Structure 1
Amino acid sequence: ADTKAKLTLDGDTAVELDVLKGTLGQDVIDIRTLGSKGVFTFDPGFTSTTSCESKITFIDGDEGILLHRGFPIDQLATDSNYLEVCYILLNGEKPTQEQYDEFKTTVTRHTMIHEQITRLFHAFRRDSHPMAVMCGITGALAAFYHDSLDVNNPRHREIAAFRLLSKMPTMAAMCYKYSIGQPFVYPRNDLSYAGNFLNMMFSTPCEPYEVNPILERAMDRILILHADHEQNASTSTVRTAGSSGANPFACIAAGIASLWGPAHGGANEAALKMLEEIGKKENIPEFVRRAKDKNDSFRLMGFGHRVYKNYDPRATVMRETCHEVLKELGTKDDLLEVAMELENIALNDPYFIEKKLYPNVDFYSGIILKAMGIPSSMFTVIFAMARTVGWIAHWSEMHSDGMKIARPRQLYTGYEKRDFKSDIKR
């Protein structure tokens, strides 16, 4: 409560509106019943309207602050692990070895996907984009696992929540395998969430796969770093889709399709082309994309962000890991050192300094991934796989608030009633 006591909506009779306050960040004006008093606001953009009250993630843009259930993303992305984090976002507190060990049990014991869904994978074309296939599948989940769709029976909600948590890794790696013609791999209980996902992505029957210690940790970190990002557009789709009653999977599919969203045009990936398509210090940058970038061709490779003011609180650690990673693999990186040069550009190139096109976690994640032997058409898929617990926690939240049904109003600026006369045929 700083420069806001009690506000007054002024029509012709003073209307006092009670200002509410969040635990962190800006407090707000209440306007719920306004409608019940024929008074509606107009804000196509919801940039001034506070959609909801939450407790999962907190982000302070300017400050470059991001917290999950109170904990600084930094600490989590360094001392915890996706599962503990997962447990946290979902439960609001850090688990006890017992809560965590039980949780870890329920999760791994459902990482297997119904075999009929494998038959579904083969129906999809071999040239299909992982993300695309990924949606195709998730969306079809409501047609099999038909018991955990009772969105209003807390008995059936934690079911799906766990199912989506156990299966997303299995599915995403099946999107990869499929796109490259290798047989799909089964889960491994005797493996960490990231180690198993690494295994499922890269192991071949030809021989046992060895999960590198540094790679295993570097992946988990990526997972941790994408687990959630507050009320963005994807969570707004998962929140809005779920408010109408849609079954769990249906929403997640939406959050996946939406996540993919701002990337589909002739120069959306055409930009994300000379990023991996070309690996050489003086070619990609060297008087090249100084103007070769055309429509977005910026906000797609991992430079800048509309939430944070000066930097990405997540990039901080992601970078620390590229070091450990490039270093480690060695014979899998040094050529990929056209990063420091790219990174560099951003840091000092005026065009960048002026556009706030600073490097973000997706850049450092891109590097790490482009290093583990993972193709760019699998980056978002992996980013969505992780954001799932985030989506899942948000949806379970909105359904605790009483399934906040998102049925906004509209401003009608079309024809007033006019009789209908048709003289045509057919």
Structure 2
Amino acid sequence: ADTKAKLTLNGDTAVELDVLKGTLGQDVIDIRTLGSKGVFTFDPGFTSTASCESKITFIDGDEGILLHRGFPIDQLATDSNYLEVCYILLNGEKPTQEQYDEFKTTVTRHTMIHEQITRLFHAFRRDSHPMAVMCGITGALAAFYHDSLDVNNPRHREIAAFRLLSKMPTMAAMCYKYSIGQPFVYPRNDLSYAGNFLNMMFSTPCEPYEVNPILERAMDRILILHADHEQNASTSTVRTAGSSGANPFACIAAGIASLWGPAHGGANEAALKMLEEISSVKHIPEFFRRAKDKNDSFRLMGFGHRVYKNYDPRATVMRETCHEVLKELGTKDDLLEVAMELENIALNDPYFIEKKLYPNVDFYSGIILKAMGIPSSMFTVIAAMARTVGWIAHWSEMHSDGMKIARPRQLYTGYEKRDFKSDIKR
């Protein structure tokens, strides 16, 4: 109970603004009606601007706190499951048995992709990145399922959403099979979300595939730990695009392209340049590449994060899980013993203590996925597939907020009006 009362802006006279309080975190200065006075604020990046009111996820960056509907991430990641967590993100409360069982049913009954989309896939190159294919197929879902782009309709919205949750995994796994030259696999209504995904990832006609319980459980936790992560650039992209009334799918497709932007946006050799110098200077079995590489550090390799100060709250369960899996797959992850050395380097090497490059969740998610046998390129794909339930929670929370259309101002500092006279002829 401090300045929870008001505040004032003085250009050359006073102006009183409210200061709405939140249930957690910082309270905000309401400046909604300023525009109608000409008074504008300037904030590229919006890091001092609350772009919305939300009740989905809460994060105290410094306290390494991650809450989803109030439920501690580590509590959900340990005692829940992907769908139950999906239900909590989309519904705000843990489900009853009837509510959950109903939800589940609906999700398994629409996990197939129109036979006509199978053809789209084929029009892509086999050497295409599984993420690009992933964006291409999602950005094209509007040309087919054209019975739910009416954003202002809770029926359409609720359907559009349910289709994404059901189909994303089928889609994600199909990028993989196409990327390796194996036939696509149809979901199994008998398996779990996670077990079903692993089957579509690795099932082959040659014989029945049996999923490992520890592996099945591990993947479900990878998803849980990726289901949502507040107002980041990708969610903000899904939010802004949606503010204009862009159909559900197009908004989900932008969230994906946005999610891996830091990857390709780096450069043909950003965190790759030194992944090539592991041949000429491989005299030292570690500092040769992924230990001398990062000249321009990356949280994309699993070290650090802008959101958290000392640690990732998602890395707790993922690391514990990472032990059970390496332990399980045993004599297949003996070589992947560099995991403890990179973890060692990050923890002790002064360069990592200095830049606070702590192993985040994607460090151990990467370890588990490599153990399971999933190619590197398929990581942000699975990451995006998991985050889509969150993107839907936000995009939907946005469509209930009166849906204010993102119409920002700009500090214009260009040419004042001037007549135009062309000096060409072509």
Is the pair's TM-score, using the shorter chain for normalization, greater than 0.5?
yes
Q: Give 1:267 shift.
A: 5.1
Q: Retained in 2: the 8 A contact 1:57–1:70?
A: yes
Q: Which moved more, 1:4-13 or 1:152-161?
A: 4-13
Q: Give 1:16 shift.
A: 1.4
Alignment CA distance shift 1:123-1:89 (3 Å)? same
- For 1:324-383, what per-residue CA distance to the aligned partner results, in whole angstroms no more than 9, with x for missing partners? 100001122111110000001000100000001000000000000011000000000000
- For 1:168-220, what per-residue CA distance to the aligned partner results, in whole angstroms no more than 9, with x for missing partners? 00000000000000000001000000000000000100000001000000000
Q: Give 1:94 shift.
A: 0.5
Q: Retained in 1: the 8 A contact 2:107–2:165?
A: yes
Q: Which moved more, 1:324-333 or 1:303-312?
A: 324-333
Q: Retained in 2: the 8 A contact 1:65–1:313?
A: yes
Q: Give 1:423 shift.
A: 2.3
Are residue 28 (structure 1) and residue 28 (structure 2) matched? yes
- In structure 2, distance between residues paired with 1:363 and 1:415: 49
Q: Which aligned segments of 4 or more residues in structure 1 are displaced greater than 6 angstroms?
A: 273-285
Alignment CA distance shift 1:290-1:202 (3 Å)? closer
Alignment CA distance shift 1:69-1:280 (3 Å)? farther
- In structure 1, distance between residues paired with 2:179 and 2:281: 30
Alignment CA distance shift 1:142-1:290 (3 Å)? closer
Alignment CA distance shift 1:208-1:259 (3 Å)? same
Q: Give 1:18 shift.
A: 1.0
Q: Retained in 2: the 8 A contact 1:315–1:360?
A: yes
Q: Retained in 1: the 8 A contact 2:275–2:289?
A: no
Q: Retained in 2: the 8 A contact 1:272–1:300?
A: no
Q: Retained in 2: the 8 A contact 1:238–1:251?
A: yes
Q: Give 1:14 shift.
A: 1.3
The number of residues matched between the two structures is 426
Are residue 256 (structure 1) and residue 256 (structure 2) matched? yes
- For 1:63-95, what per-residue CA distance to the aligned partner results, in whole angstroms no more than 9, with x for missing partners? 000000110001000100000000110000010
Q: Give 1:273 shift.
A: 8.1
- In structure 2, distance between residues paired with 1:316 and 1:274: 29
Q: Give 1:6 shift.
A: 2.1
- For 1:35-56, what per-residue CA distance to the aligned partner results, in whole angstroms no more than 9, with x for missing partners? 1111111111211111110000
Q: Retained in 2: the 8 A contact 1:8–1:16?
A: yes
- For 1:154-179, what per-residue CA distance to the aligned partner results, in whole angstroms no more than 9, with x for missing partners? 01000010000000000000000000
In structure 2, the residue matched to 1:150 is 150
Q: Retained in 2: the 8 A contact 1:160–1:248?
A: yes
Q: Give 1:13 shift.
A: 1.9
In structure 2, the residue matched to 1:372 is 372
Alignment CA distance shift 1:77-1:291 (3 Å)? closer
Q: Give 1:299 shift.
A: 2.0
- In structure 1, distance between residues paired with 2:290 and 2:365: 23
Alignment CA distance shift 1:259-1:283 (3 Å)? farther
Q: Give 1:118 shift.
A: 0.2
Q: Give 1:291 shift.
A: 7.2
Structure 1: runs of 5+ lacking an equivalent: none
SS in 1 for 2:139: helix
SS in 1 for 2:303: coil
- For 1:367-408, what per-residue CA distance to the aligned partner results, in whole angstroms no more than 9, with x for missing partners? 000110000000000000000000011000000001121110
Q: Give 1:281 shift.
A: 14
Alignment CA distance shift 1:146-1:183 (3 Å)? same
- In structure 2, distance between residues paired with 1:231 and 1:168: 21
Alignment CA distance shift 1:197-1:333 (3 Å)? same
Q: Retained in 1: the 8 A contact 2:4–2:20?
A: no
Q: Give 1:298 shift.
A: 2.4
Q: Give 1:284 shift.
A: 7.5
Paired-residue identity, %: 98
Alignment CA distance shift 1:347-1:279 (3 Å)? farther
Alignment CA distance shift 1:86-1:274 (3 Å)? farther
Alignment CA distance shift 1:414-1:302 (3 Å)? same
Q: Retained in 2: the 8 A contact 1:281–1:341?
A: no
Q: Give 1:2 shift.
A: 3.3
Alignment CA distance shift 1:99-1:2 (3 Å)? same
- In structure 1, distance between residues paired with 2:270 and 2:423: 49
Q: Give 1:268 shift.
A: 6.8
Q: Retained in 2: the 8 A contact 1:141–1:249?
A: yes
Q: Retained in 1: the 8 A contact 2:300–2:362?
A: no
Alignment CA distance shift 1:321-1:8 (3 Å)? same
Alignment CA distance shift 1:75-1:290 (3 Å)? closer
Alignment CA distance shift 1:412-1:311 (3 Å)? same
SS in 1 for 2:23: coil
| TM-score relative to the length of structure 1 | 0.96
Alignment CA distance shift 1:300-1:12 (3 Å)? same
Alignment CA distance shift 1:199-1:234 (3 Å)? same
- In structure 2, distance between residues paired with 1:11 and 1:168: 51
Alignment CA distance shift 1:71-1:133 (3 Å)? same
Alignment CA distance shift 1:30-1:211 (3 Å)? same
- In structure 2, distance between residues paired with 1:172 and 1:204: 16
SS in 2 for 1:263: helix
Alignment CA distance shift 1:174-1:206 (3 Å)? same
Q: Retained in 2: the 8 A contact 1:263–1:269?
A: no
- In structure 2, distance between residues paired with 1:391 and 1:286: 38
SS in 2 for 1:283: coil
Alignment CA distance shift 1:213-1:281 (3 Å)? farther
Q: Retained in 2: the 8 A contact 1:268–1:296?
A: no
- For 1:264-288, what per-residue CA distance to the aligned partner results, in whole angstroms no more than 9, with x for missing partners? 1565766368789989998776332
Q: Retained in 2: the 8 A contact 1:130–1:378?
A: yes
Q: Retained in 1: the 8 A contact 2:58–2:66?
A: yes
Q: Retained in 2: the 8 A contact 1:224–1:386?
A: yes
